[PDB]
Amino acid sequence: IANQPVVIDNGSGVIKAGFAGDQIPKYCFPNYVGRPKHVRVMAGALEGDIFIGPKAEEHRGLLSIRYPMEHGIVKDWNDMERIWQYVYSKDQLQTFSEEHPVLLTEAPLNPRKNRERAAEVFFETFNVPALFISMQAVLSLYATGRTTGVVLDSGDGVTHAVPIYEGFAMPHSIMRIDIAGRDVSRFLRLYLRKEGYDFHSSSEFEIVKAIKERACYLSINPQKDETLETEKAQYYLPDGSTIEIGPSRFRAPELLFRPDLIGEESEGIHEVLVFAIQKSDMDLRRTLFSNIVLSGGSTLFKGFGDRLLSEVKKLAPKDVKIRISAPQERLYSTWIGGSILASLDTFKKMWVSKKEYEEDGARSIHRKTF
Amino acid sequence: RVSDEEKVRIAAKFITHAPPGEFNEVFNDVRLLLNNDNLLREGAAHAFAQYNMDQFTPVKIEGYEDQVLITEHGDLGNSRFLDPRNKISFKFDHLRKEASDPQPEEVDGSLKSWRESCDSALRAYVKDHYSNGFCTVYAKNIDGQQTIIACIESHQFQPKNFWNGRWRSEWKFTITPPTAQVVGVLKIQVHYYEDGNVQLVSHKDVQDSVTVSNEAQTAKEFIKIIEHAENEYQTAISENYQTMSDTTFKALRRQLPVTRTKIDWNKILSYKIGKEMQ
Amino acid sequence: SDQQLDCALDLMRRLPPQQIEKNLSDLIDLVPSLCEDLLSSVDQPLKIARDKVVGKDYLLCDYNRDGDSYRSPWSNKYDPPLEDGAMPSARLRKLEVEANNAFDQYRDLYFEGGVSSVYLWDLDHGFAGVILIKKAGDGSKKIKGCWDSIHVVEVQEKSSGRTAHYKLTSTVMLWLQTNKSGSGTMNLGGSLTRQMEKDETVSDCSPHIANIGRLVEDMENKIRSTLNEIYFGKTKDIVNGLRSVQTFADKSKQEALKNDLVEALKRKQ
Ligand SMILES: Nc1ncnc2c1ncn2[C@@H]1O[C@H](COP(=O)(O)OP(=O)(O)O)[C@@H](O)[C@H]1O
């Protein structure tokens, strides 16, 4: 146990978690595994052959990266098991499965079977007394504090805008495209190869992802940066060498506004937002213009909301009072809200009645955790 | 000079094909097109009668207040309906719910006792599980076979955003001892008209057979079968919407080019891409 | 008359348009005094047109029609054969052949069938025309309908500075005659109506036709999206709302505890 459990945020690329009652997810690390590739010549050296965490973020070009969750969907379940075990570690948990009424998140629009399999793991294998899993937006409602809102959370490999009302969103006003800067950086690398730069290796591409999170802006111009050309704002490698930029510095980040140009059946961020608004009522939209919530790391862009609002102006009807809530800790805001929910004793029927839960299964899967 | 007799079939077609909710208002508009009530009522009376009998038009006597539905098993033709539960004969107007003079009739009445608990459990599930879903089970001992007549109406008519929609369905448990039959037909009529036409019409009609046991077994049996079939087909409709997005649209209007990415119009304007190679 | 016209508008607004001709017959046999400009307000379906001097299919519409003689863009002729061949700009006529050619390719890209016909003319500075795409529910699928893409291209072609203006009016009829066993006897559908404008400094590499294909396609996508989202989910909203598959005696208490959580939110805010 009756102490501080853990709030666990997902992420196809970066998973997060932390002890309740705090304001920051105590442990955050990416969603992949690092396994080396060379002969164990010198005995007694770094052995174990499976790295996650500091050694993973340390021995970059010394391992083999493998993400088990794709499009927010885990397929290499065993790798996530080991990632969970990394969370269970003495560096992180120092606990057992039978010690806390832990919390976990899950984005909507997913088959229940994923959650079912996770429940099978954390209840058949792990003897967790109570493990709740909810959506990924009420958390943000707790963070913002408001009841009426339009929650947007730029995931590791997902995007989803949903308008909620007092913690009760429509089961239809749901907009989502599993996308992020991942393929953006991939296409950026494609540009680079058609500019003389191929970074096909796993970690080699992760450095490009650092560049993604480093030199990507969002201008408001339609073709000004396209007709012009930047002078390669030269940055330098951790390796210690030249890093040009090239005019294309906006082309990959500006692509998410019109991602269908890549041969995609998507709809576009602003259109996604508009459609979420369209699926709602009428008077509520008036309030929802004044209720805009942004979350995720892919929101961290130079001129992000400006071009987004320009698209809104060119698309949404009149009498709109835009109120974008885009603070710094948009990522932690989710974990913050989860910690707030974990700070509740009124969580009674929400917490899993483990024994009876296993005796029920499917029905209890559709009943207890949501 | 057009013959006004044609207008009788015109307004009759208008009455019959009118979706629920969108009937009296535009019907009055049809009168405005005709400027006469007598010419209208030349065939509009019979049209009113049958159009209400089939659309499960909601009717409610004050003596029972079960919110019965306009059909043929209570009807007498003289604007006088009968209670499918306490067999009262009572006059009932049709442009409004003006009902009077309850007269409890007499028939074999055995089946009535059966449909009492049948409609009780059925109506209990339908009320506690469908918002405006409300049923009425008529009963008739025609051709030596008892008839359980389930009529379900469900609507929400608030066209403030130019929308309407109504569910109706009739399922007959033809009690033919020993093996009774599960007969039935659905009815869907939804309509939206704020900048775009939406005319949703669908149904499903099936029949099964099983031997009569008692009242409770057959009650839960028949209602459970229809219940699951309706929920099942409702799920099928949801999946039909799923089949729309991917098949139907792309079966007619595709989303992407042959290269599935973009369209260079100037490349269409010139170059002659290789239209003479093969 | 006027009030009867309003009645006819609401009538057509609520009438099932699969009987447009019979409903129009009801409209004439009911009010023949207002038989003047019936199809001006009432939306019409599309009509097949096969040329004979050329031998190629085209379409039948308003502007190609001369009284009763439709213009064949294959021969640029009025059918029944008349010497009243008022034809527009021959250069633009050939450009129209190229446009309809590109759009036939376009309909073979996104539709693979039907007929496209943008019958235009040549006004003072600009002109207009109509986009016509006839593609009903193919026999290849029991799910059918009648795809009719009628759009109005309104080019307010300016002169100074190689610029021009565009204005698109739109409507696409189609039914959903999906009568499979899993669909039962499902039928839905209709048409929309939208508009948009443009003030382009029209160069030579991107002609008016390019703008047409672009924004028209964009509009179609918006329409398709609007349909798939709003109307389908809307219908399903009404379905699950009226006929639900949700057992109560639970949602009350769970939402009550959720409101207690909101109370706790107020306890800190
Ligand atoms: N500083 C940054 N600049 C640009 N993009 C970023 C930055 N930080 C994170 N991102 C992008 O946003 C995503 C962060 O996702 P996150 O919200 O943690 O995922 P989830 O919600 O699925 O856990 C990553 O895919 C990353 O590329």
Residue-range domains of chain C with CATH: 1-88 (1.20.58.570), 89-269 (3.90.1150.210)
- Under 8 Å CB pairs connecting chains B and C tally to 212
Start-to-end CA span in chain A (Å): 22
DSSP secondary-structure letter at B19? P
Determine the distance in angstroms separating the CA of B168 from the nearest CA of chain C, rounded to an integer: 10
Determine the distance in angstroms separating the CA of A282 from the nearest CA of chain B, rounded to an integer: 9
Give φ, ψ of C64 to 5 degrees: -75, -30
Any atom of ligand 1 within 6 Å of the Cβ of A7: no
Query: Residue B261 carries which side chain, given as an amino acid letter?
Result: T
Give CA–CA dist A14/A157, Å, rounded.
9
Helix (H, G, I), strand (E, B) or coil at A60: helix
Start-to-end CA span in chain B (Å): 66
Helix (H, G, I), strand (E, B) or coil at A153: strand
Cβ of residue C224 closer than 8 Å to a chain B Cβ: yes
Q: In C, which residues are within 8 Å of A275 by CB distance?
A: 225, 229
Closest CA to C43 of C171, C207, C222: C171
Q: In B, which residues are within 8 Å of C16 by CB distance?
A: 17, 199
Any atom of ligand 1 within 6 Å of the Cβ of A180: yes
Q: In B, which residues are within 8 Å of C11 by CB distance?
A: 14, 26, 29-30, 33
Domains A1-136+334-368 and A137-178+267-333 share a fold: yes
Q: Domains of chain B by range and CATH?
A: 1-107 (3.30.1140.60), 108-252 (3.90.1150.210)
For C238, the token pair is 């009404």
Cβ of residue C213 closer than 8 Å to a chain B Cβ: yes
Q: Could you tell me whether strands C186-190 and C146-155 are parallel, antiparallel, or unpaired per DSSP bridges?
A: unpaired
Determine the distance in angstroms separating the CA of A209 from the nearest CA of chain C, rounded to an integer: 32
Nearest to C257 among A145, A271, A346 (CB): A346
Backbone φ/ψ region at C196: left (φ over 0), alpha (ψ -120 to 50), beta: beta
- Show the CA angle centred on residue B159, arms to residues B156 and B163, nearest 5°: 75
Give CA–CA dist C200/C202, Å, rounded.
5
Start-to-end CA span in chain C (Å): 62
Are the C-beta atoms of A107 and A10 separated by less than 8 Å? yes
| Class of CATH domain A137-178+267-333 | alpha beta
Give CA–CA dist A137/A336, Å, rounded.
11
Whole-Å CA distances, C75 to B15, B70, C81: 47, 61, 11
Residues 6 or more apart in contact with residue B136 via CB below 8 angstroms:
B56, B66, B67, B68, B69, B71, B84, B119, B150, B151
β-pair partners for A19: A6
Resolution (A): 6.7
Interval between CA A154 and ligand 1 midpoint (Å): 7
Are the C-beta atoms of A336 and A329 separated by less than 8 Å? yes
Q: Which CATH superfamily is domain A179-266 in?
A: ATPase, substrate binding domain, subdomain 4 (3.90.640.10)
Are the C-beta atoms of C141 and C103 separated by less than 8 Å? no
- Under 8 Å CB pairs connecting chains A and B tally to 11
Q: Which of C 122-161 lie inside 8 A of B, CB atoms?
A: 135, 137-138, 141, 143, 145, 147
Give φ, ψ of A102 to 5 degrees: -65, 155
Give φ, ψ of B59 to 5 degrees: -135, 150
Give φ, ψ of C97 to 5 degrees: -65, -40
Tell whether omega for the bond before A101 is within 30 degrees of 0, i.e. cis: no
Give CA–CA dist A116/B240, Å, rounded.
26
Query: Residue B205 carries which side chain, given as an amino acid letter?
Result: D
Any atom of ligand 1 within 6 Å of the Cβ of A175: no
For A6, the token pair is 């853990």
Residue A176: Cβ within 10 Å count: 19
Cβ of residue B27 closer than 8 Å to a chain C Cβ: no
Are the C-beta atoms of B136 and B61 separated by less than 8 Å? no
Are the C-beta atoms of A218 and A253 separated by less than 8 Å? yes
B77 by Cβ neighbours in 10 Å (0-12 / 13-18 / 19+) ranks as: exposed
Residue C11: Cβ within 10 Å count: 20
Are the C-beta atoms of C44 and C90 separated by less than 8 Å? no
Whole-Å CA distances, C169 to A239, B86, C146: 58, 59, 19
Give CA–CA dist A57/A60, Å, rounded.
6
For A134, the token pair is 């909810």
Residue A66: Cβ within 10 Å count: 13
A1-136+334-368 maps to CATH 3.30.420.40? yes
Nearest to C269 among A145, A166, A271 (CB): A145
Residues recorded for chain B = 278
The protein residue with its alpha carbon nearest to ligand 1, atom 3, reads: A213
Nearest atom in ligand 1 to the alpha carbon of residue A12 is 22
Give CA–CA dist C51/C79, Å, rounded.
9
CA B89 to chain centre: 25
β-pair partners for C128: C154
Give φ, ψ of A55 to 5 degrees: -75, -30
Are the C-beta atoms of B124 and B220 separated by less than 8 Å? no
Query: Residue A180 carries which side chain, given as an amino acid letter?
Result: A
Give CA–CA dist B116/B269, Å, rounded.
75
Helix (H, G, I), strand (E, B) or coil at A170: coil
Sign of the torsion angle spanned by Cα atoms B117, B118, B123, B125: positive
Give CA–CA dist A177/A268, Å, rounded.
9
Residues 6 or more apart in contact with residue C198 via CB below 8 angstroms:
C165, C166, C167, C211, C215
Give CA–CA dist C205/B267, Å, rounded.
9
Give CA–CA dist C64/C44, Å, rounded.
15
For B211, the token pair is 């031997």
Closest CA to C143 of B198, B189, B248: B248
Closest CA to A18 of A330, A370, A300, A337: A337
Query: Residue A196 carries which side chain, given as an amino acid letter?
Result: G
Tell whether omega for the bond before A68 is within 30 degrees of 0, i.e. cis: no
Query: Residue B95 carries which side chain, given as an amino acid letter?
Result: L
Backbone φ/ψ region at A319: left (φ over 0), alpha (ψ -120 to 50), beta: left
Tell whether omega for the bond before C80 is within 30 degrees of 0, i.e. cis: yes
Domain positions in chain A: 1-136+334-368, 137-178+267-333, 179-266
β-pair partners for B33: none
The pairs formed by B23-32 with CB atoms below 8 angstroms and a separation of 24 or more are B23/B51, B24/B95, B25/C10, B26/C7, B26/C10, B26/C11, B26/C14, B29/C6, B29/C7, B29/C10, B29/C11, B30/C7, B30/C11, B30/C30, B32/C3, B32/C4, B32/C7
Backbone φ/ψ region at B109: left (φ over 0), alpha (ψ -120 to 50), beta: left
For A346, the token pair is 């009124």
Q: In B, which residues are within 8 Å of A271 by CB distance?
A: none
Q: Which of B40, B154, B246, B252 to mutate to test the interface with C (most CBs of C within 10 A)?
A: B252
Q: In B, which residues are within 8 Å of A262 by CB distance?
A: 261
